[PDB]
Amino acid sequence: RPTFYRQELNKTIWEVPERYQNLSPVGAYGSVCAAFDTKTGHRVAVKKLSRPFQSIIHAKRTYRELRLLKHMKHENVIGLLDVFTPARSLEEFNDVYLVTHLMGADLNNIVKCQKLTDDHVQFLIYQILRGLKYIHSADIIHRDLKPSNLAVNEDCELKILDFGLARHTDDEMTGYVATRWYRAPEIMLNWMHYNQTVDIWSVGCIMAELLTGRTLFPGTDHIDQLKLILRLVGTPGAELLKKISSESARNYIQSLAQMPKMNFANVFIGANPLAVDLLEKMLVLDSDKRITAAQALAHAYFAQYHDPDDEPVADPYDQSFESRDLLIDEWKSLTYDEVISFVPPP
Ligand SMILES: Nc1ccccc1N1CCN(CCO)CC1
Ligand SMILES: [Cl-]
Ligand SMILES: [Cl-]
Ligand SMILES: [Cl-]
Ligand SMILES: [Cl-]
Ligand SMILES: [Mg+2]
């Protein structure tokens, strides 16, 4: 067990191992500090969870986040560098700290500020799809892909972060907000049980924005956004209507006048024809018919970068805990076991 030291920073007590030095606050579910890790030479983010075990819902969310971060081991996905608690036993266990690489710029900064060549778009979207092939192979759905959840460094290398770990609130998704502009219509409107195909819809929205410099579907509310979507991809046919489970949602769709799919070459003027082709295969209304991550990596748009011997899949991921009903102290004990069994990366 390492030696810990205490200090108060912006009204919060931080108790951390001596290896972490020069803590500096940098910003819902916890507080974050930047620090220098003297054992590895890494510049890191240290997150202290806020009230991790205050309710059954919150204790299960703490366990879910720690299990997910411990599993992710891929070049294009955020990984876990360390996890610690100052507690010396389960009986005094109350605080959880998570350590990751400190991230600088996100894709928001790049799209708004830089001039991107087609080669930049190829490399950035290739890396998102490479990470998604890995994530989806473990039957994990990210659910919240958007530019602020994609970190990028000076060499245009990219990492996926901030997995969807709790339900977003109704208020967070209301109005003219980027939190909703990248969501697939079937989850935005609760049409049906969703699956991993929702993440490919988000990649299409991000790729369009890199090519034009503008948000693809900037709706002022749920219904305005749906109208923008259906004007581009067309209104649904009877085949997809069969798959919408809410009678009321089906009724609303049929109240709209029918519209054909638009010509994407006349929307994304001057783009690489291979980029136009890939966008038509991602932005498909019926989720059963969208291209998958593994299929998209083999598309000719990525011929410069595709290497099927360097696109790995994940170890199996057991999510059976998600249907388990436990007491707070039982979720807490499961979390404690995962903290003390952590083994750092090479
Ligand atoms: N590779 C990478 C890709 C996208 C965004 C950021 C980074 N690095 C991670 C490594 N770190 C240095 C050691 O703490 C600098 C940022
Ligand atoms: Cl230490
Ligand atoms: Cl990482
Ligand atoms: Cl503690
Ligand atoms: Cl964003
Ligand atoms: Mg985020």
Side-chain angles (χ1 to χ4, degrees), residues 42 44 101-103 151-153 157-159:
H42 295 151
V44 298
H101 282 291
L102 186 66
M103 300 291 146
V152 177
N153 72 9
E157 304 173 326
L158 175 144
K159 287 189 199 295

Side-chain angles (χ1 to χ4, degrees), residues 74 77-80 101 103 159:
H74 187 278
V77 182
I78 191 66
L80 189 60
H101 282 291
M103 300 291 146
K159 287 189 199 295

